[PDB]
Design a protein around this motif. Structure first.
Motif, PDB file in Angstrom:
ATOM      1  N   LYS A 274       0.812  -1.209   0.000  1.00 29.94           N
ATOM      2  CA  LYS A 274       0.000   0.000   0.000  1.00 29.94           C
ATOM      3  C   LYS A 274       0.849   1.265   0.000  1.00 29.94           C
TER       4      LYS A 274
ATOM      5  N   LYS B 125      -3.483   8.271 -14.372  1.00 33.02           N
ATOM      6  CA  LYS B 125      -3.268   8.844 -13.047  1.00 33.02           C
ATOM      7  C   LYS B 125      -2.444  10.121 -13.119  1.00 33.02           C
TER       8      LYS B 125
ATOM      9  N   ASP C  24      -5.273  -3.338 -18.795  1.00 30.76           N
ATOM     10  CA  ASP C  24      -3.922  -3.883 -18.893  1.00 30.76           C
ATOM     11  C   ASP C  24      -3.835  -5.166 -19.714  1.00 30.76           C
TER      12      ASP C  24
ATOM     13  N   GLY D 227       1.607   1.515  -3.571  1.00 30.31           N
ATOM     14  CA  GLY D 227       0.398   1.329  -4.348  1.00 30.31           C
ATOM     15  C   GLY D 227       0.519   0.277  -5.433  1.00 30.31           C
ATOM     16  N   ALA D 228       1.067  -0.888  -5.084  1.00 30.17           N
ATOM     17  CA  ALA D 228       1.276  -1.963  -6.047  1.00 30.17           C
ATOM     18  C   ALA D 228      -0.039  -2.461  -6.635  1.00 30.17           C
ATOM     19  N   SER D 229      -0.871  -3.088  -5.802  1.00 28.25           N
ATOM     20  CA  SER D 229      -2.163  -3.617  -6.224  1.00 28.25           C
ATOM     21  C   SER D 229      -2.990  -4.022  -5.012  1.00 28.25           C
TER      22      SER D 229
ATOM     23  N   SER E 142       0.872   5.400 -14.169  1.00 24.72           N
ATOM     24  CA  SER E 142      -0.186   5.393 -15.167  1.00 24.72           C
ATOM     25  C   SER E 142      -0.393   6.797 -15.716  1.00 24.72           C
TER      26      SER E 142
ATOM     27  N   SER F 203       3.429  -1.609 -10.332  1.00 22.80           N
ATOM     28  CA  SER F 203       2.787  -0.305 -10.192  1.00 22.80           C
ATOM     29  C   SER F 203       3.600   0.683 -11.017  1.00 22.80           C
ATOM     30  N   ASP F 204       3.297   0.740 -12.309  1.00 24.36           N
ATOM     31  CA  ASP F 204       3.910   1.716 -13.191  1.00 24.36           C
ATOM     32  C   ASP F 204       3.129   3.020 -13.128  1.00 24.36           C
TER      33      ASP F 204
ATOM     34  N   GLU G 190      -9.872  -2.145 -14.839  1.00 21.68           N
ATOM     35  CA  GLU G 190      -8.418  -2.261 -14.893  1.00 21.68           C
ATOM     36  C   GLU G 190      -7.979  -3.507 -15.659  1.00 21.68           C
TER      37      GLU G 190
ATOM     38  N   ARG H  34       9.566  -2.331  -9.015  1.00 18.83           N
ATOM     39  CA  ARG H  34       9.855  -1.313 -10.019  1.00 18.83           C
ATOM     40  C   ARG H  34      10.353  -1.936 -11.318  1.00 18.83           C
TER      41      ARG H  34
END
Ligand SMILES: C[C@@H]1CC[C@@]2(OC1)O[C@H]1[C@@H](O)[C@H]3[C@@H]4CC[C@H]5C[C@@H](O[C@@H]6O[C@H](CO)[C@H](O[C@@H]7O[C@H](CO)[C@@H](O)[C@H](O[C@@H]8OC[C@@H](O)[C@H](O)[C@H]8O)[C@H]7O[C@@H]7O[C@H](CO)[C@H](O)[C@H](O[C@@H]8O[C@H](CO)[C@@H](O)[C@H](O)[C@H]8O)[C@H]7O)[C@H](O)[C@H]6O)[C@H](O)C[C@]5(C)[C@H]4CC[C@]3(C)[C@H]1[C@@H]2C
Ligand SMILES: C[C@@H]1CC[C@@]2(OC1)O[C@H]1[C@@H](O)[C@H]3[C@@H]4CC[C@H]5C[C@@H](O[C@@H]6O[C@H](CO)[C@H](O[C@@H]7O[C@H](CO)[C@@H](O)[C@H](O[C@@H]8OC[C@@H](O)[C@H](O)[C@H]8O)[C@H]7O[C@@H]7O[C@H](CO)[C@H](O)[C@H](O[C@@H]8O[C@H](CO)[C@@H](O)[C@H](O)[C@H]8O)[C@H]7O)[C@H](O)[C@H]6O)[C@H](O)C[C@]5(C)[C@H]4CC[C@]3(C)[C@H]1[C@@H]2C
Lengths: 923, 923
Positions: free
Chosen positions: B145, B417, B513, B148-150, B414, B411-412, B509, B406
């Motif tokens: 968290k 975002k 993706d 903010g991975a998933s 976006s 969590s690239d 989502e 990374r």
């Protein structure tokens, strides 16, 4: 092996059941618990199994009650109460409560010695006095918040009861040590040393630990678990150190700690505050139900086998006498507190003296006495009388206080509140009708049983001169309602502090109860006149206090006296904060009052049928506003640095509140997810808490900076450079008149120091540092119309009109000098027009100023002296010129807010008025 | 006397300090605690005073760790996670976690037996395996968290780790009883009975107590303390009964209890939920810091005096081997769960197998083993290896997981975002600039040092065919972002449930993706196709199940079988609720998706420059919407009563949400104080929780009620009486065509049962119970334009056009029949025009429908065929007629949304179009 789980779990379940059953009934639930305990007595006397499961919790050690239950109860009582409302009258209510408790306890002790047939001595008499003088705040505050009696009455009762509990516990502990442990002998010196310890070194220790832990928590940001665990560990450590030394009388220390943690709201996040409040509330609820169950079981088992009818007769006499004593004490004391400057009406007095409800503290003390007594009858008599007084009070007073409240009209149905609830209910009904009409035509929800949906709409909530006096009375009531509405609207906009709002609504409700009186400026002066006290003299001595080096050389364990130098500035900083903590609230009243006043003026000017009543109302309100602004300006002159600091704080607070409003508007519009909004609000809160740690004093900026930071000069270095090249400095003394009415436009003024008075036409105002005088005169070339007199010594920056014309001709960029000047004077002259015409519900000064900021001054050269009207623009204001409409030949002259039905209009060029107008186009 | 206060308070302070210092550094704070404990070891070996103050808390009884610390840790880890997201993946995660943990434990046990030089039997080896297989969810989910991975990866890891902890505790308890208490001997029958108890009668007991206490709490309203104390007493009672019988393996029971109390959100207030979450979080934090401090002290004192270099070599081999085993197990298992219908990508697999972080549970088990061992070296070896694995994992994996995250791009950043944050920051900057510009021209705040205020503004946050493929890719991404924005806007309006919103954003989502696909209707079908399962057959059996009376007469302890009859209806009710709990969410997807579609069709067509891309996008979205509405109508036909109940629930929820919005708008406007708003919100919440207890099934209303409750027939009894007099009932079978294109306006049609298809000119739709067909034909006398085919058997109510003309002529009141019909058709035809023209940010279907409801159809007879325009009205829509503007001679034909710059216009009377138009005037 002792067995405890059954009793504790059953007591929790019984508390839940009795608490839910008696929500509507008027008597409190706790007596039911006592009654249930009584049943658990009798069965335990017959069945040995119930005795086996009960006797290990019912007959506890006295040290459990003296060490676990009582500190928890007193700390929760001192934590739930709002400390700030207690602080405004803390010393007066302190002296009142302590002297009243001592008088009542001595009176009850003498009565117990004389009236009863038992052979009791004096040290066993003040024990009885201190047992039966520990009231309860929670029941009365819940009752007063149920019917909504009053905030001030509730908090006064709560504070007095807390002080009563504290000193009753202290007296009980002293006399219990005197009676049940007679070998502990002390002389007068030991007694005065113990009293000094209890009354000085306990609260000081609690204060010290509270301040140290607040300083610790001030270094921790965005971390709830650490704050919670640190506060709980600090509370336990304070109690433990104060309880191995002062015994039960150490509870005072943690009491003080609670108040400190109840006061600070910056270093502790609100989530931590609500968690700690709920935690201590649950702990006190557990202790209370347990105490009531045990007292019921014990009073049925053994305390009711040695009772005669004379005991019941004595109990009823005692119940009469405690109320008689409380009433006599309050009535005798009230003249003294009225003389000292404390308001205590007779209705408040009778409600307060009938509002003493005995709680669990008296029962805990009685249980301790019964456990220590053993087989003597003194314990049984103590417990029986205490339980009897508790049950009699909870049955009688908790029900008759509603009767007294309704008879005396403490909380009467306010026609203001009636109109407010009626309007809210009508709007709710209209909205629900609109929603149902929309839903019944939907494509999907077309087959649901609409009878249930319609049933869901159920919303219900419970020219003679004397006639002119009634008219002015109702006009005053409407004015006070408008004032309260403006105060609430300002507070919800993030403009007023909670204490400032509470003070304003207190003055509003008092003026509503006053004899045709309004908010008095003399009464309002107490908000910011506490600046001139011992902190000011202390700061003067501390910045007046060479010899230090000689003293240090002489010293070279007095070496730590060098730390005195290291303590020299910090105290100064501390006292600065105190002055800040007195100045900010003052502004948060004063300025706020100003804003509210203006709105209510328009309101009365639109509602009073008689012109005389509204004229007199406007006159008195205007002179009150003028007095307030004059006093504010004098205060600004008196203390520069703290005023600058508080104004910076106000500006940053407003900016952050509006940024948070933008965040919420974006989040509600779907453009921001929960994570982004949470993170940005976190950054905003971090910046806000950084602002709360800003320096309390800031050096006053030089006048060159004030000249540089003019609202229209900023933007380019050429402008400020040329203005600095052609600016003059002028000094004026007391009583001087700078310019007069009818004089030509000599130039533009700028007040950079002092206070000036601007009067003319019948209208007058007071201007301070940063204000600008005479933009219209230098713009439109008309002669000045307002004479300025120097209220005090004043320094101004004078710029001549010819130099301003030269500068206007020199710079002709897109943000032109004349364009910016005309825009500024346009918004300043167009705000009152929108205030007068659009006086609807929900438009404040900040919102209308932002709405005008969205707009712009529109040129008429491209329109060829004929403006094209549109339905896109929200409003159009005629600032300069004279508009002519060929349709119906309508002639309008500036300034005016033209109606929305006005279509295209033309203009005629003249040498005296070039057409300029303001528009606020929609997004 | 044992001394404990110093150690506990110092450990709390050290936890606070280490938690604050390492808020930015990559490694977790807990290792610091362990390091500090190590220091406290060495000093305690030398100074006897520190030994005296430490040895009473460092060397505890194993029963404290087995009874107090471990149940708190496991209950908190079970209580923190969201239970609904775990239950959505229950079937795969449960089997995966259990069998994989057993496989890993056996492998580690065999490795411990073979690789090490110590002589260990199989039971101690399995104890070692069960100790080192207990991971930690909290650190992993905090890390995931933080960057903010998933969400899905985090909750999957959390659930799998919780199951790992539970099974590891059970295995450890069994093998500890085997090793350290060898006299306890059991056969195969005793072993299988114990396993059956642990795996069946524990969770069942927890489930039973949880349901009973939820039923208790459902009777308590507006009472927080009772809910808190009842939940805490229930938790303790469940643990106590499950711990005197199953020993440590009873923790499973309270685990299950946590999940149940984490699921129900109706009978428990949100304040109680947040308080319980914070309470258990603080307790687990205390237990964790204490466990780490004790393990550090013990591992330095005595566990590091019997260690060779071969032990370090074995420790590094073991650290390699546990990760190798986890990776091999996950890679071997993944094909099976992919086959069974579980999504487990290889990137998720490698992140999950590298994300296993050892926590305090392994250390607590190692401490218990060390305490039970005594002077044997097995305890020292166990503690040394467990602490070594914990520190190696916390140092290596907790830092390299960011590198892997990374590198793999979990969590690239976006670009969606990025655009969202850029727009929000730009709006924030514009708003702050506007606020500062307003404040710098204020009368009072004119002297503050504006440099600090300006520094407060610092806010920042971190035609080739291939080109056509890239263009359609970015158009797809824009469409999915618009869909997500619409979903969030709907949820914030109180229209979608949290589970429905989560499901929709999951589809959004996944369609983002994965390839160039969109949200598929076939994948969406799982939301409402779980209606046809074993609950339906069970309901059929239960309502098909005289014979009972005969059996009861035959019986007259089998008498309690009569209670079976009393058990007959309740289960039926229960299963009805389950079907409701499957249908509601389905609608909360389905309808919601439709609304989302009704946004994007008004957006992307204005954005895409190439007609082909937008044409194909509109085609695929339209056919998806048509499939969704067809499936929804078929579902409505399948199960009438539950559909009626859920639609009534949706209507009441929308009504209450809008009433709450009105309350908040009134409170923010100052017309309502805090007390009145609090009370009215309390009443609204009471009504909402009453709605949550509504029956899950409602009988279908008769067609007479549907005819009566038409959106425009309601209002007078004469109208409904005459309509009922002149209404015909018609029945049509499969494949029939009622009317065709070009046919005359025979009359109005009402669909009271069945699903019909309306297709014509290229546009088609499906209509259900309550829809009305052909108002335009019966109003404007124009022939019909869309054929209707009976999708299934359909009953309709047919009213002839002549009868409705007679009714129109008969009633001529102010709410005329023709007026109501024209208003309804006007809003229905005017909604898409405002959707197309006013497609700004923040206008949803509900808001625009309410805004049109505020408006009215304006008569043109009084205006003499010439309407007067105004700037007061927000919008004006042409419904019927042809408008002519003499200025510039502008001819506009119905239907059209005329521009706001359109001024006054005239009309010409014709026999085909009487002029009618809609206006929405401002308040
Ligand atoms: C802060 C809020 C308020 C409410 C609460 O917390 C939240 O407050 C807490 C706190 O107040 C707690 C209490 C504190 C005091 C505790 C006292 C304890 O009794 C002690 O129990 C010990 C054994 O565990 C010893 O008892 C002897 O034990 C021997 C075997 O070891 C027996 O043999 C012998 O008999 C026993 O000794 C017997 O002790 C009995 C005394 O109860 C007999 O009367 C007699 O003496 C004697 O034969 C000891 O001697 C005795 O004292 C009792 O077991 C539980 C107890 C009451 C606690 C129950 C739970 C609480 C109320 C907690 C409660 C949740
Ligand atoms: C749930 C969360 C997690 C964290 C926490 O709560 C929140 O968990 C709670 C819980 O877990 C608590 C612990 C539970 C277990 C407790 C055990 C207790 O020890 C007991 O203390 C008794 C005191 O009367 C007896 O000790 C004997 O007392 C005699 C009289 O003074 C001596 O004589 C004799 O020596 C002592 O007996 C000696 O006691 C020693 C104990 O170290 C050895 O056993 C020694 O052998 C033995 O001769 C008894 O015999 C001994 O057992 C200790 O005092 C405190 C203790 C550790 C507690 C400390 C605080 C906690 C951690 C709480 C903590 C906040």
């Amino acid at each position: 092996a002792p067995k405890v789980i059954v009793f504790i779990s059953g007591s929790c379940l019984f508390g839940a059941i009795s608490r839910s059953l008696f929500k509507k009934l008027p008597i409190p639930y706790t007596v039911v618990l006592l009654i249930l305990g009584a049943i658990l007595g009798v069965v335990a006397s017959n069945v040995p199994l119930v005795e086996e499961h009960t006797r290990d919790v019912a007959h506890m050690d006295p040290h459990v009650l003296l060490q676990i239950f009582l500190p928890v109860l007193i700390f929760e009582s001192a934590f739930a109460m709002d400390v700030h409302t207690f602080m405004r009258s803390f010393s007066q209510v302190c002296i009142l409560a302590l002297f009243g408790l001592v008088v009542a306890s001595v009176l009850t002790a003498v009565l117990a010695m004389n009236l009863f047939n038992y052979n009791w001595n004096f040290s066993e008499a003040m024990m009885f006095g201190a047992i039966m003088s520990a009231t309860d705040p929670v029941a009365v505050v819940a009752l007063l918040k149920d019917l909504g009696a009053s905030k001030q009455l509730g908090t006064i009762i709560e504070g007095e009861s807390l002080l009563n509990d504290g000193c009753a516990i202290v007296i009980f502990n002293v006399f219990m040590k005197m009676v049940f442990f007679p070998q502990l002998t002390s002389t007068v010196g030991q007694n005065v040393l113990y009293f000094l310890q209890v009354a000085v070194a306990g609260p000081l220790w609690g204060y010290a630990v509270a301040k140290v832990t607040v300083f610790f928590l001030s270094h921790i940001f965005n971390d709830a678990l650490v704050e919670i665990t640190i506060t709980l560990a600090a509370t336990y450590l304070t109690y433990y150190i104060g309880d191995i030394w002062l015994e039960v009388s150490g509870v005072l220390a943690v009491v003080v700690l609670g108040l400190i943690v109840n006061a600070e709201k910056t270093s502790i996040s609100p989530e931590v505050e609500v968690f700690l409040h709920r935690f201590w509330e649950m702990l006190a609820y557990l202790a209370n139900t347990l105490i009531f169950m045990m007292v019921g079981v014990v009073v049925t088992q053994k305390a009711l086998v040695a009772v005669d009818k004379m005991d019941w007769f004595y109990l009823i006499i005692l119940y009469l006498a405690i109320t008689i004593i409380a009433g006599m004490v309050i009535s005798l004391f009230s003249p003294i507190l009225s003389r000292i400057g404390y308001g205590l009406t007779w209705r408040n007095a009778v409600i307060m003296t009938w509002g003493g409800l005995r709680g669990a503290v008296g029962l805990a003390l009685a249980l301790v006495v019964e456990n220590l007594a053993g087989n003597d009858v003194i314990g049984s008599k103590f417990l029986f009388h205490t339980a009897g007084i508790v049950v009699l009070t909870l049955v009688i007073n908790a029900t008759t206080i509603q009767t007294l409240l309704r008879i005396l009209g403490m909380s009467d149905i306010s026609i203001p509140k009636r109109l407010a609830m009626a309007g809210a209910v009508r709007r709710i009904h209209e909205g629900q009708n609109r929603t149902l009409n929309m839903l019944k035509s939907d494509r999907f929800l077309a087959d649901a049983d609409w009878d249930i949906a319609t049933a869901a709409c159920e919303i219900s909530d419970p020219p003679s001169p004397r006639e002119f006096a009634d008219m002015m009375e109702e006009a005053r009531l409407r004015m006070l309602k408008a004032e309260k509405i403006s105060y609430w609207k300002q507070f919800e906009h993030g403009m007023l502090a909670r204490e400032a709002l509470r003070l304003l609504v207190q003055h509003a409700e008092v003026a509503a109860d006053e004899k045709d009186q309004f908010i008095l400026v003399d009464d309002l002066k107490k908000s910011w006149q506490i600046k001139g006290i011992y902190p000011w003299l202390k700061r003067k001595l501390e910045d007046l206090i060479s010899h230090w080096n000689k003293f240090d050389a002489f010293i070279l364990g007095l070496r730590m006296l060098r730390l005195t130098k290291a303590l020299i500035p910090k105290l100064i900083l501390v006292v600065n904060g105190k002055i800040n903590n007195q100045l900010s609230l003052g502004y948060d009243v004063g300025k706020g009052y100003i804003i509210g006043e203006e709105e209510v003026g328009k309101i009365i000017d639109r509602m009073v049928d008689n012109k005389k009543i509204l004229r007199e109302l406007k006159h008195i309100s205007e002179t009150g506003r003028l007095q307030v602004v004059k006093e504010l300006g004098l205060l600004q002159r008196e203390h520069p640095g703290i005023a600058v600091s508080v104004k910076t704080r106000q500006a940053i607070r407003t900016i952050l509140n509006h940024s948070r409003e933008t965040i919420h508007e974006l989040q509600g519009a779907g453009l921001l997810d929960e994570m982004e909004a949470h993170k940005l609000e976190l950054t905003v809160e971090i910046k806000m808490k950084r602002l709360m740690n800003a320096p309390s004093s800031i050096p006053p900026p030089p006048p060159e900076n004030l000249l540089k930071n003019v609202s229209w000069l900023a933007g380019d270095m050429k402008l400020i450079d040329f203005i600095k090249a052609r600016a003059s400095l002028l000094h004026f003394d007391y009583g001087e008149v700078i310019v007069r009415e009818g004089d030509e436009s000599d130039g533009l003024f700028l007040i950079v120091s002092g206070l000036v008075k601007l009067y003319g036409k019948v209208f007058e105002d007071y201007l301070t540092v940063g204000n600008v005088i005479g933009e219209m005169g230098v713009l439109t070339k008309k002669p000045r119309n307002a004479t300025v007199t120097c209220e005090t010594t004043v320094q101004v920056y004078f710029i001549t009109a010819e130099d301003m014309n030269i500068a206007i001709d020199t710079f002709t960029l897109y943000p032109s000098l004349e364009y910016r000047l005309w825009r500024v004077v346009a918004i300043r002259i167009a705000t009152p027009l929108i205030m007068e015409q659009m006086a609807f519900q929900g438009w404040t000064q900040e919102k209308v100023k932002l709405h005008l900021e969205r707009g712009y001054l529109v040129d008429l050269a491209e329109s060829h002296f004929q403006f094209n009207i549109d339905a896109t623009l929200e409003d159009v204001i005629l600032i300069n010129g004279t508009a002519y409409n060929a349709h119906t030949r309508e002639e309008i002259r500036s300034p005016c807010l033209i109606s929305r039905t006005v279509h295209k209009l033309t203009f005629q060029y003249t040498a005296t008025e070039e057409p300029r107008l303001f528009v606020v186009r929609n997004a």
